[PDB]
Amino acid sequence: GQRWELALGRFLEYLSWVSTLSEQVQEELLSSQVTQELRALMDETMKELKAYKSELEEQLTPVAEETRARLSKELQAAQARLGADMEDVRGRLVQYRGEVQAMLGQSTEELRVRLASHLIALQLRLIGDAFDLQKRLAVYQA
Amino acid sequence: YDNREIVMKYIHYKLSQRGYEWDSEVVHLTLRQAGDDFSRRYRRDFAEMSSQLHLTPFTARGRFATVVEELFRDGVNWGRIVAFFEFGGVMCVESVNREMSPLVDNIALWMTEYLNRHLHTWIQDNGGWDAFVELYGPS
């Protein structure tokens, strides 16, 4: 239970440092090392998550099946949203990069306030999507 | 009807945690705890209204709209409405920390109607508000 959550906590913790938008971060954001790192922590989060739904499908033994072609389908889509949020976080920082590249490495505050807007929206939706899951990973298991 | 009250007490409560306070109760309680579980995943490996934006009295309606759109861009679930409540709270405590507060009443009327108009429809489909307490209650 608490391992795909830890991989997620490593994605969020790194994103947390990118949300600081420090001089350090902005210099980093003009390279491909921050978006490459985000994909790793995401492809780890999804790996630990995909291997954990399988881990439940083993000890999950009650198997009421008229509604379980609805159950797992609701959760196979509710993990589809988590990988979606983490892909979006990565893309929002690809757009920031391509935007400052058209400004010759420069970066306005109108852009950084706009990026901070999207990062906050994503952090919230990320946590909330992971909440709608961890609860739905206790109706599965219980 | 309901949603006006739910916002009132949730904003009420979000002042307390920042050394502040200004102007079926199992719903209000469960939502209060949900926002706490939610927020100590937030401020756990994050920081507060620290990942902030440039918030003036004139841009607050714009940042509220930008964030709330992207929050529900691709569907609605209960975990995101908690974020919507958490975000609305993050608005109000950034206000008094940045020297605004009648904004809070605006933010308060920027959450109610949005539940009333564009969220009320999804609420009754997945079981109404009493469905939220049934899924987040005895947990």
From Swiss-Prot, chain A:
Disulfide bonds: none annotated. Glycans are attached at residue 53. APOE exists as multiple glycosylated and sialylated glycoforms within cells and in plasma. The extent of glycosylation and sialylation are tissue and context specific. Plasma APOE undergoes desialylation and is less glycosylated and sialylated than the cellular form. Glycosylation is not required for proper expression and secretion. O-glycosylated with core 1 or possibly core 8 glycans. Glycated in plasma VLDL of normal subjects, and of hyperglycemic diabetic patients at a higher level (2-3 fold). Changing residue 59 to K: In ApoE5 Frankfurt. GO terms for biological process: acylglycerol homeostasis; AMPA glutamate receptor clustering; amyloid precursor protein metabolic process; artery morphogenesis; cellular response to lipoprotein particle stimulus; cholesterol catabolic process; cholesterol efflux; cholesterol homeostasis. One of its GO terms (cellular component) is collagen-containing extracellular matrix. It is found in: Secreted; Secreted, Extracellular space; Secreted, Extracellular space, Extracellular matrix; Extracellular vesicle. Changing residue 136 to C: In HLPP3; ApoE2, ApoE2 Fukuoka, ApoE1 Weisgraber and ApoE3**; ApoE3** is associated with HLPP3; changed protein structure; decreased binding to LDLR and other lipoprotein receptors; decreased in vitro binding to heparin; no effect on distribution among plasma lipoproteins. Changing residue 114 to C: In HLPP3; ApoE2-type. Sequence repeats lie at residues 40-61, 62-83, 84-105, 129-142. The modification Phosphoserine is found at residue 107. It is linked to Hyperlipoproteinemia 3: A disorder characterized by the accumulation of intermediate-density lipoprotein particles (IDL or broad-beta-lipoprotein) rich in cholesterol. Clinical features include xanthomas, yellowish lipid deposits in the palmar crease, or less specific on tendons and on elbows. The disorder rarely manifests before the third decade in men. In women, it is usually expressed only after the menopause. Alzheimer disease 2: A late-onset form of Alzheimer disease. Alzheimer disease is a neurodegenerative disorder characterized by progressive dementia, loss of cognitive abilities, and deposition of fibrillar amyloid proteins as intraneuronal neurofibrillary tangles, extracellular amyloid plaques and vascular amyloid deposits. The major constituents of these plaques are neurotoxic amyloid-beta protein 40 and amyloid-beta protein 42, that are produced by the proteolysis of the transmembrane APP protein. This is Apolipoprotein E. The chain holds residues 41 to 182 of 317 of the full protein.
Curated annotation (Swiss-Prot), chain B:
A motif (BH4) lies at residues 2-22. Changing residue 122 to A: Loss of BAX-binding and of anti-apoptotic activity. No effect on homodimerization. Changing residue 134 to A: Partial loss of BAX-binding and 50% decrease in anti-apoptotic activity. One of its GO terms (molecular function) is molecular adaptor activity. It is found in: Mitochondrion outer membrane; Nucleus membrane; Endoplasmic reticulum membrane; Cytoplasm. A motif (BH2) lies at residues 121-136. This is Apoptosis regulator Bcl-2. It comes from Homo sapiens. The chain holds residues 9 to 205 of 239 of the full protein.
